[PDB]
Amino acid sequence: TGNFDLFVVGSGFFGLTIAERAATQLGKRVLVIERRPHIGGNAYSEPEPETGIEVHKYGAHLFHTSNKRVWDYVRQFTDFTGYQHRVFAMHNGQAYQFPMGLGLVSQFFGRYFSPDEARALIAEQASEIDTKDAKNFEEKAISLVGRPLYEAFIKHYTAKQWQTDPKDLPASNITRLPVRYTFDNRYFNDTYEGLPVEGYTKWLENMAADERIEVRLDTDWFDVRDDLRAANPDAPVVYTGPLDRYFDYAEGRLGWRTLDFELEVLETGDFQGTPVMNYNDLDVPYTRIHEFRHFHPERTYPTDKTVIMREYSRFADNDDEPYYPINTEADRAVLAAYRARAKAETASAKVLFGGRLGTYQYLDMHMAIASALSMFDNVLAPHLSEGASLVTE
Amino acid sequence: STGNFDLFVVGSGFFGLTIAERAATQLGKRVLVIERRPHIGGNAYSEPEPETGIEVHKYGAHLFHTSNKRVWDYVRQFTDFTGYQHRVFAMHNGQAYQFPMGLGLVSQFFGRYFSPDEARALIAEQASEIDTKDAKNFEEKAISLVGRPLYEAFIKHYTAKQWQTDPKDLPASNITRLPVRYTFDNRYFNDTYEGLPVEGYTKWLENMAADERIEVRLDTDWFDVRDDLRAANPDAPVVYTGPLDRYFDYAEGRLGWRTLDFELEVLETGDFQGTPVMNYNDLDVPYTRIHEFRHFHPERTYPTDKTVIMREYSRFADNDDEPYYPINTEADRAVLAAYRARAKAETASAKVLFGGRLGTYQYLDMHMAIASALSMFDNVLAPHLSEGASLVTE
Ligand SMILES: Cc1cc2nc3c(=O)[nH]c(=O)nc-3n(C[C@H](O)[C@H](O)[C@H](O)COP(=O)(O)OP(=O)(O)OC[C@H]3O[C@@H](n4cnc5c(N)ncnc54)[C@H](O)[C@@H]3O)c2cc1C
Ligand SMILES: Cc1cc2nc3c(=O)[nH]c(=O)nc-3n(C[C@H](O)[C@H](O)[C@H](O)COP(=O)(O)OP(=O)(O)OC[C@H]3O[C@@H](n4cnc5c(N)ncnc54)[C@H](O)[C@@H]3O)c2cc1C
Ligand SMILES: O=c1ccn([C@@H]2O[C@H](COP(=O)(O)OP(=O)(O)O)[C@@H](O)[C@H]2O)c(=O)[nH]1
Ligand SMILES: O=c1ccn([C@@H]2O[C@H](COP(=O)(O)OP(=O)(O)O)[C@@H](O)[C@H]2O)c(=O)[nH]1
């Protein structure tokens, strides 16, 4: 079919940022090809039929950023609530303040530690390694929170989530979490955050709203690309699906994690009194439980029912959609081969690669969007509007 | 010009300055604000601690919050607000507790996680020890509401320190100030809008007094200057926000108030307690709370190696003390009744209105004081100033 100026594979925040930018800022005709039956990638939301409560289909999505560029951009498509994310950690039958801060320290060690007292305590317990010298997840984690807290709140959660030796996981995984010596327990440390007032799916649909954008759901790129590109040969492609799958796993399989969920409607108005409860112990199969009513107190939610979602992690087999890049040293070697294939495909077939799946990177929503805005301004727009090379100067 | 005052306002706290600003800017009236202290703002006055430069509140820590959008929109004319949300922690038997009482405190104190339903059931059954109807005092009523363990831990001795009044003889609404939750929400206030003034309270207050039609007299006692000022401006009403009993020479007796003492101290550490306010719920320390002011403004560049803290002590307001909180004994409410009659008669004969915390013997938060002043303005003072309407009501 035609006519299109640009193809985008995948309708997550990366793909839709590209589509919206090309359509509105250049007046380009965009075709977005989505294999799932819905838009939005893993950020897709939908109502639970019984309660009418909006659920994040793939587990809680919390938006946060310190990038004002991004904040201004996304506010063109949605309003945000004043929500600030806080997570509690269940360990040995007790709910703990989390992440690292004077709350967690005083609870776990059984009495109040002042900022200076806590700094001294953790410094002793972390002394087996300095943070600068840390070379993997386990080392970095211990260097920041100390061995006792590492063993209680990090080690077993990480084992459930990754089922991978912590000495072979990336150090940057732990630096996602704030590390504090105050009573501050905000899960993020960014300037801006909140939840979309009308929900994620509305926000995503608003990004795809321009008349120059066409979205085709339930369509696999690899089934339709040859005839699509033949009819529109000038159009480049932005691919946001799994990187290894694009090349038919020719350089080996990257390790990914996937998730399963159990959604349950309960006959109580409030199951756990907080949106997300982490379960840090090996004795329960799920990593955390989401209770979505707490994300939108402003809505007309029932007061005698609630929807919760248990989250279970496992390896992405060949049958599964991947959710998390694992990035072991072995993975990173396979990734290097795929990055080489990707750059070749960009030069030859005018296919760009982006997003969590397209680049095998642990990307939050705001980082995917920043990345797409950059790709559009610096690489794609000059190609589309002056015929500049996708192999940039 | 100067003088030819249309309105006298006694006191330059948030109530008085709201009145003065509204009369000036909305009605074009000339206002004289008479203030006995050497600065405006009443107890909300802020200033920098000299050694650290950190902005402190010498008359007590002040946290702004409101659920009234009209009040919010009004105060934002004079200041911007940070995104600060107040949280308080409670020190008991050497441990820091999440506070106010919610799933955090419940889980910490009772030693395991309680779900919303489990916590509701727990509190209900412990509270069942005493029937609220049969409660003979503060202690029994507190127990009948939250149960004996929570009462004996976080309310009993803290209440004893701050009021030194029989808990059975204190207003029930006092505890209503704290939100009560079966969630993990520990945001101290329940109000829609809050934050700290970006340039501090004193700048906010100065902006309220900025209109050229407002003249302010500092270091001036209304009772020293009123006769000749009113003789020169006989038509001008008076909005009095000083002490109600002092106004009438304590003729009906003296109203009971609590006062606070403060000890400001600069410490050679960048962070003393990692949070703005720590309550001390136990009898083994004499102060009720410690404030650490750097945490009121994280957005500012404060010293990395010093901090200013302020210990708070509560006692009876003796004759030379500043009154902070009304005690409201039955003898007090009776004394108040007599003064309320005096006040109404004075409104009728002398065109004096009584307002604010001191003027009405009523504790008032800032947002309450501002709302009260806006209401007085709309219903009583502005129609009087604009149309000659009567100041007499109810
Ligand atoms: C469990 C989970 C929790 C998360 N929580 C947060 C959070 O709290 N805060 C935050 O900021 N971010 C969070 N994220 C990240 C977020 O979901 C996205 O990864 C982020 O928005 C990046 O989007 P993306 O477009 O790069 O990838 P995706 O959202 O995965 O979109 C890629 C799209 O490509 C589609 N696709 C794949 N192959 C094909 C094909 N052959 N043909 C057509 N379409 C194809 C896919 O169906 C998918 O829709 C979470 C992610 C996951 C998995
Ligand atoms: C320790 C303390 C802590 C507080 N903490 C908070 C808080 O966290 N959040 C919040 O919202 N509110 C708080 N408040 C309330 C806050 O101070 C309000 O702004 C205040 O109640 C406003 O009411 P007001 O203007 O009538 O009182 P005031 O602020 O007391 O002003 C009355 C003024 O009248 C002056 N005056 C009295 N007699 C005379 C006289 N004869 N002649 C001339 N002038 C006179 C006084 O000097 C004073 O300046 C606190 C109050 C106190 C005392
Ligand atoms: O209670 C927790 C939370 C996080 N993590 C570790 O920190 C990483 C990042 O945590 P995040 O909360 O960012 O994970 P996501 O929500 O992206 O799955 C996890 O993969 C774990 O390895 C942990 O060990 N315990
Ligand atoms: O840890 C606390 C905090 C408050 N209160 C009671 O609740 C009242 C209201 O507390 P607030 O924090 O509102 O007091 P303020 O800041 O006005 O002095 C206090 O007077 C006490 O009687 C208590 O018993 N324990």
Side-chain angles (χ1 to χ4, degrees), chain B residues 15 35-36 61-63 221-222 246 356-357 363-364 366:
Chain B
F15 192 100
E35 173 56 60
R36 72 177 315 190
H62 279 59
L63 290 311
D221 180 356
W222 175 240
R246 187 175 187 256
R357 193 178 49 90
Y363 176 74
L364 298 179
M366 294 177 272

Side-chain angles (χ1 to χ4, degrees), chain A residues 63-221:
Chain A
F63 189 81
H64 59 99
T65 184
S66 294
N67 186 320
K68 180 64 150 57
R69 177 230 328 190
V70 174
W71 186 236
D72 291 342
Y73 174 70
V74 296
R75 280 187 297 168
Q76 299 171 301
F77 307 102
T78 185
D79 294 324
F80 290 90
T81 71
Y83 182 81
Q84 297 164 357
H85 195 42
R86 286 174 166 85
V87 170
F88 285 78
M90 195 78 73
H91 171 56
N92 288 341
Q94 178 62 293
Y96 288 86
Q97 292 164 94
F98 199 72
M100 174 64 184
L102 299 187
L104 175 64
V105 168
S106 59
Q107 279 191 263
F108 185 71
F109 296 105
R111 53 100 161 169
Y112 169 64
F113 288 74
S114 71
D116 287 333
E117 288 170 342
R119 275 184 186 281
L121 178 74
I122 301 299
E124 161 43 10
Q125 295 169 347
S127 63
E128 66 186 72
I129 34 187
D130 281 22
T131 303
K132 326 193 72 72
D133 304 331
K135 336 150 193 56
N136 60 51
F137 176 75
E138 174 161 278
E139 287 182 1
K140 194 87 162 188
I142 291 165
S143 76
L144 290 167
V145 305
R147 185 163 280 283
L149 285 177
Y150 172 72
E151 306 267 352
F153 293 96
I154 305 303
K155 193 165 187 179
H156 295 163
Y157 183 98
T158 295
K160 296 200 286 181
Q161 162 63 359
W162 297 101
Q163 285 175 307
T164 295
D165 173 24
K167 298 177 178 68
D168 201 13
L169 285 174
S172 60
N173 279 13
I174 198 59
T175 50
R176 292 169 54 80
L177 276 51
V179 178
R180 298 187 184 103
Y181 289 96
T182 63
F183 280 99
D184 190 349
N185 69 324
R186 283 186 58 178
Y187 202 67
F188 305 117
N189 200 33
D190 282 312
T191 308
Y192 311 106
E193 84 176 273
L195 284 151
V197 170
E198 298 293 339
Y200 281 98
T201 286
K202 184 66 168 198
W203 172 3
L204 292 150
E205 280 173 352
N206 284 347
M207 294 186 61
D210 194 89
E211 63 181 60
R212 284 272 194 271
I213 299 168
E214 178 182 357
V215 179
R216 291 182 193 170
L217 305 174
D218 298 298
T219 303
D220 198 310
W221 178 235

Side-chain angles (χ1 to χ4, degrees), chain A residues 300-362:
Chain A
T300 318
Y301 288 170
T303 54
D304 58 350
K305 296 181 180 187
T306 190
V307 56
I308 66 171
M309 180 183 285
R310 292 174 296 272
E311 176 173 319
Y312 308 82
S313 174
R314 69 186 166 75
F315 287 105
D317 297 328
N318 315 153
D319 196 329
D320 301 322
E321 8 182 54
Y323 294 2
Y324 297 81
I326 299 177
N327 273 294
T328 65
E329 184 179 59
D331 289 317
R332 292 186 320 209
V334 176
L335 175 62
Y338 277 121
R339 286 201 188 155
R341 301 292 304 263
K343 289 187 69 175
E345 184 77 340
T346 294
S348 296
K350 307 310 179 295
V351 177
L352 296 175
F353 293 80
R356 175 173 284 215
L357 308 182
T359 66
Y360 193 72
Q361 295 294 267
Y362 202 142

Side-chain angles (χ1 to χ4, degrees), chain A residues 354-372:
Chain A
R356 175 173 284 215
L357 308 182
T359 66
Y360 193 72
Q361 295 294 267
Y362 202 142
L363 296 183
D364 292 329
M365 287 179 281
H366 69 292
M367 297 303 285
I369 294 170
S371 175

